[PDB]
């Protein structure tokens, strides 16, 4: 199937194993924001549920299925690959929902439905978005959707951003430098110093801060769910021109993402920016191994390059340069290995 | 084990 | 090969990528217990090392080796199965040593020596000691040991002992009760609250705590590297009867382990035990799914049954009873799935 064919299988049995545990099931129920947006999406948008087939990919536990049963959804398909499905299926006979929730066990790229679908719900957003690459199997499932039929969540923004963290820069630089150490117990590990910064500057920083540490107005990349075919995700390219706001030095560009529910009566943002409550994404970093000094007034230009991976990840490029000086910083991260930081 | 081997301080 | 009869492929490759991190094997390295122990070992021992033949398994950075190579080692053959055999040989050039330690990169059990050894040196104890199944990869490289070759570390002592923490005991029962309500955004969870439980009862606890929720002294499980074979380590019975020292609600067994490196000129400890200062193995609880009441000098007896399983780990079974009072209970645990909970 179009999963297989994209994804290691041993990628896919991990994936599938995380999210099998009730554990991690509730980590995502009790961000609020979340579920609370989520729900707020589908109830005040009910007509766009009323007497509607709708597809729920990735179900999880079925919490957005309920959702649009509570909305008046006639049937709901919940398609869930984990072993989940099994408890969401104990939820929708506890809750007397057989008639009108329907779960689906399998990769949602390789089971039947027996009819086209007026609205996909789903919540496919991982770490900057795109990790994970579920957006792909939300996009996917736009072969069982109705024309004009519609997507909650409809449209994806990221922000990026150059940010300013002397004290994290340090933190990181201290760790690598473990192996800049000429007599570590009468051993020389000097010579492993250049691979140790790349490997700790590999790693995206997943954690919250305070958005003064941001140097410029962010850059947005909008993905219209609606419009999107699953390959537009395999090589996303997002150019960067920042006018610099401060002077000082950029360790590096912040990301975050928000996602908007179109609704017939409103339109609902789901926001993880860091000016917002804080959500079980937090925001994330991606650190220049060398920060790159601006004055106000500067342009930082370049490109940030997002190439799918075949672990359900990213792996990722960010060339910046200072125009004013040519001073520049070249980039290579592992999303699917980030520093959780908090 | 994902990460056999836990972080000290 | 033996290795790949054993292991799943998908577990090989995630653990031999985990070891591949700098950043990992630096965890190991600045744990000062662990490696100032293993060199402490080695230099005081130099009538070992001195002009001999040594072989590391699973170098890593090489740190042992170069221990070894500060002892007056000849040779040191060092294998590696990971990316991290790459940073090894860098390390090896960059200290003058590539005629005394040659980086072999490959599992210890597929790849071949050129000629046999006089002393084998590894840092194989996982937590709990068998987890990583490690031990079975040392175990197996005495096929390159020389006769009346010595193991360092040579033997290996696994402690249990039964603990009180109740509020470690009632906690799992407050996470799973997130399910245990009727209405989550109108939506009623109860049903699976008792798989929830089940769920957080199957993770052993690794962290360290205050040795006075020991109830009774540790009862130990000692392997002889010298003597033990593989299939020694494929099924683990390790049976107790605690002389209980305190009255209480017993809710656990809690485990630790020490090593020992028995050399010519003396005999050095690595402990990992909760009365020593912390290493980076903290110690490992396994839960009773029902605690046990039991007196000051009653016996606690039963078994703690490790399962070797192609993860490269162990499916844990323990059963335990008060001999006095017929009250017992039981539990079965994951041990390659544990909460981390010193986090
Ligand atoms: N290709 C796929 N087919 C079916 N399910 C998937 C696929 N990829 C991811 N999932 C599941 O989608 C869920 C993603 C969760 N973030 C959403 C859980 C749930 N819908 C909720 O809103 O709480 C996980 O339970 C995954 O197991
Ligand atoms: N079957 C095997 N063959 C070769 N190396 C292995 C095998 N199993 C585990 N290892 C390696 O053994 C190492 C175990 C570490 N605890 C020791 C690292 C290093 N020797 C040190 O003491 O700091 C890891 O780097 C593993 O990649």
């Given at each position: 199937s179009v999963f297989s064919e994209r994804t290691e299988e041993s990628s896919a049995v991990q994936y599938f194993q995380f999210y099998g545990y009730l554990s991690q099931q509730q980590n995502m129920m009790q961000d609020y924001v979340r579920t609370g947006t989520y729900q707020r999406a589908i109830l005040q948008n009910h007509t766009d549920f009323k007497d509607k087939i709708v597809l729920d990919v990735g179900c999880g536990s079925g919490i957005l299925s309920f959702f649009a049963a509570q909305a008046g959804a006639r049937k709901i398909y919940a398609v869930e690959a984990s072993t989940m499905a099994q408890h969401a299926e104990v939820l929708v006979k506890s809750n007397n929902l057989t008639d009108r929730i329907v779960v689906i066990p399998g990769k949602v790229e390789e089971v039947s439905l027996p009819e086209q679908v007026d609205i996909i719900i789903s919540e496919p957003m991982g770490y900057m978005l795109?990790?994970?690459?579920?957006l792909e199997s939300y996009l996917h499932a736009?072969?069982?959707?109705?024309?004009s039929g519609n997507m909650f969540p409809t449209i994806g923004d990221v922000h990026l951003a150059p940010f300013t963290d002397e004290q994290l820069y340090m933190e990181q630089f201290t760790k690598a430098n473990?192996?800049?150490?000429?007599?570590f117990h009468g051993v020389d590990?000097?010579?492993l110093r250049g691979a140790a910064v790349d490997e700790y500057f590999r790693q995206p920083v997943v954690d919250t801060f305070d958005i003064?540490?941001?140097?410029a107005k962010s850059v947005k990349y909008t993905v219209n769910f609606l419009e999107a075919?699953?390959?537009?995700?395999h090589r996303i390219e997002i150019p960067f021109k920042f006018h610099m706001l401060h002077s000082g030095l950029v360790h590096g560009l912040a990301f975050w993402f928000d996602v908007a529910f179109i609704g017939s009566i409103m339109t609902v943002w789901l926001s993880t920016a860091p000016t917002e409550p804080l959500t079980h994404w937090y925001q994330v970093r991606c650190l220049f191994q060398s920060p790159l000094f601006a004055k106000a007034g500067d342009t930082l230009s370049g490109t940030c390059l997002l190439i799918a991976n075949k672990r359900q990840s990213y792996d990722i490029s960010i060339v910046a340069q200072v125009d004013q000086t040519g001073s520049k910083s070249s980039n290579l991260l592992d999303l699917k290995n980030p520093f959780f930081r908090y | 084990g994902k990460a056999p081997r836990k972080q000290l301080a």
């Amino acid at each position: 199937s179009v999963f297989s064919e994209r994804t290691e299988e041993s990628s896919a049995v991990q994936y599938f194993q995380f999210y099998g545990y009730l554990s991690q099931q509730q980590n995502m129920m009790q961000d609020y924001v979340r579920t609370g947006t989520y729900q707020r999406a589908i109830l005040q948008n009910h007509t766009d549920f009323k007497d509607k087939i709708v597809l729920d990919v990735g179900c999880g536990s079925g919490i957005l299925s309920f959702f649009a049963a509570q909305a008046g959804a006639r049937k709901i398909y919940a398609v869930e690959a984990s072993t989940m499905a099994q408890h969401a299926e104990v939820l929708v006979k506890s809750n007397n929902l057989t008639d009108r929730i329907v779960v689906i066990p399998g990769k949602v790229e390789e089971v039947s439905l027996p009819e086209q679908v007026d609205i996909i719900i789903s919540e496919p957003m991982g770490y900057m978005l795109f990790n994970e690459r579920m957006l792909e199997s939300y996009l996917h499932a736009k072969k069982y959707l109705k024309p004009s039929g519609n997507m909650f969540p409809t449209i994806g923004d990221v922000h990026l951003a150059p940010f300013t963290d002397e004290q994290l820069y340090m933190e990181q630089f201290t760790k690598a430098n473990f192996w800049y150490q000429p007599s570590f117990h009468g051993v020389d590990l000097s010579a492993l110093r250049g691979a140790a910064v790349d490997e700790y500057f590999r790693q995206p920083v997943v954690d919250t801060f305070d958005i003064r540490i941001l140097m410029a107005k962010s850059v947005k990349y909008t993905v219209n769910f609606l419009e999107a075919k699953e390959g537009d995700l395999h090589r996303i390219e997002i150019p960067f021109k920042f006018h610099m706001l401060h002077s000082g030095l950029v360790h590096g560009l912040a990301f975050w993402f928000d996602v908007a529910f179109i609704g017939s009566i409103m339109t609902v943002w789901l926001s993880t920016a860091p000016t917002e409550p804080l959500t079980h994404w937090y925001q994330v970093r991606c650190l220049f191994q060398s920060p790159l000094f601006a004055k106000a007034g500067d342009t930082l230009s370049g490109t940030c390059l997002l190439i799918a991976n075949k672990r359900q990840s990213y792996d990722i490029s960010i060339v910046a340069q200072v125009d004013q000086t040519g001073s520049k910083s070249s980039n290579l991260l592992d999303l699917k290995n980030p520093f959780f930081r908090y | 084990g994902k990460a056999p081997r836990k972080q000290l301080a």
